């Protein structure tokens, strides 16, 4: 029901906050981390999209180890975000499979993030190999078009349980504000039928707001902050993000 | 169409904060009073259903000048709950309304509350006569124990309408979450398509707090807070509510 990354207990309380380090370079990727110290959050996201080289390994490498050296006691979660699926760069499938098992090989990062929509064979690999070493995946989709019916957003939530995800989480777009009431319906459905971990669910830009703020009582166990820049449309600023959280965990 | 109560425009901005008084006698009422003075919040409403013998018009209309010569500078809002409705008390229709007119007739109040289901005739000639004396009106409708269906909901918010409301007012509790949904709902459906001037929605209990915060994105105009160390579940103070209506404002 709950998943254990470092001490940090993901599912149980108020949700947790993520937060996205993108830097290009490793030193931009550095100077990042430090500025990153300065902020209350609980789960490092590094943005390996936005990394340059990212298909050169072991810079890729050598960047993770530089953000563990100076951020050592927050979870850090690998996350490329294809473009496909609105991030900064596309990769192939055997690139983007290969710089995750990577990943997981290198005894650096607590969780990757894997993409639903990258393929079942690949995505079920790949999460046995990330157990067999011990690394959490947080499965994703994305909708940066519109909001898909209710019941579609929970069948894809059931699926990446079933593809062994340690917590499914989607991000859609509302057109209208009804659309931000059916991505809480789908978070309310998912809770009550399927669920069996945490799930982390969100609608985007500033009319979704009120998902990454209201994510306890209706099943979203963790939400995205901004420290300098959002990394998705909709993020507020990290410290006004927990103030938000505390007081709805304690109304 | 927004309303303005001294200075306080109603339906712009971020919501409105109101706090509740409650006293026994005049000496409860000015403590209330003096307590409540430097809080932050933008109108008071004073639960008269809470006094004793209200059926003595000089004393409700001493206890509510009391509150004028204590807090000056907020809008005062009239509020006789009926047992019906989750109040403390019991009037006639007639004793009703007349008190509610003594208070219109005061010019101590800048606001009444008049009850939906108190019935067509007396409810729309006493909209008139307030108006007739630059009063507004709040109508209001509350279901403690269970949320009607949201069709429901915006049927009762548009006959407030119909009746003059300057705003429509409902209170229901959610035995579930969807329950909240409901009435998020609702409030998006009467606020895009039918209302034509601002409302009020709120779902109780620590279940429906979303209410409280989101009424900027889903149409609600104003949300009730604590000023009094002690509150109950879902009942924000009031100086986090503003935090939080200004955080979600400023997004
Ligand atoms: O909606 C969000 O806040 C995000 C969703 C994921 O794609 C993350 O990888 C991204 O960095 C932020
Ligand atoms: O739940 C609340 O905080 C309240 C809501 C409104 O019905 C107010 O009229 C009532 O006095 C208190
Ligand atoms: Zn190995
Ligand atoms: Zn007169
Ligand atoms: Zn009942």
Do not use: C
């Not at 473009?83 to 005894?107: F, H, M, P, W």
């Amino acid at each position: 029901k709950t998943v254990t990354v470092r001490d940090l207990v993901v599912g149980e309380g108020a949700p947790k906050i993520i937060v996205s380090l993108m830097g290009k370079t490793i030193t931009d990727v550095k100077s990042e981390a430090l500025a990153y110290r300065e902020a209350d959050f609980d789960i490092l996201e590094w943005r390996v999209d936005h990394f340059a080289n990212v298909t050169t390994a072991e810079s890729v490498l050598e960047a993770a180890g530089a953000i563990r050296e100076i951020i050592t006691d927050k979870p850090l979660l690998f996350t490329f975000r294809s473009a496909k699926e609105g991030g900064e760069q596309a990769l192939t499938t055997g690139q983007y499979i290969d710089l995750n098992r990577a990943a997981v090989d290198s005894g650096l990062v607590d969780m990757i993030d894997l993409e639903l929509f990258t393929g079942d064979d690949e995505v079920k690999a790949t999460v046995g190999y990330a157990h067999q070493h011990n690394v959490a995946v947080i499965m994703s989709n994305h909708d940066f078009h519109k909001t898909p019916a209710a019941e579609e957003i929970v069948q894809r939530l059931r699926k990446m349980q079933e593809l062994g995800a340690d917590i499914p989480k989607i991000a859609v777009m509302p057109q209208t504000k009804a659309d931000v009431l059916t991505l809480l319906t789908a978070t309310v459905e998912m809770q009550e039928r399927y669920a069996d971990r945490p799930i982390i669910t969100m609608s985007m830009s500033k009319t979704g707001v009120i998902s990454r703020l209201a994510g306890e009582v209706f099943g979203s166990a963790a939400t995205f902050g901004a420290v300098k820049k959002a990394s998705a449309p909709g993020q507020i600023s990290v410290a006004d993000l927990r103030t938000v959280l505390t007081i709805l965990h304690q109304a």
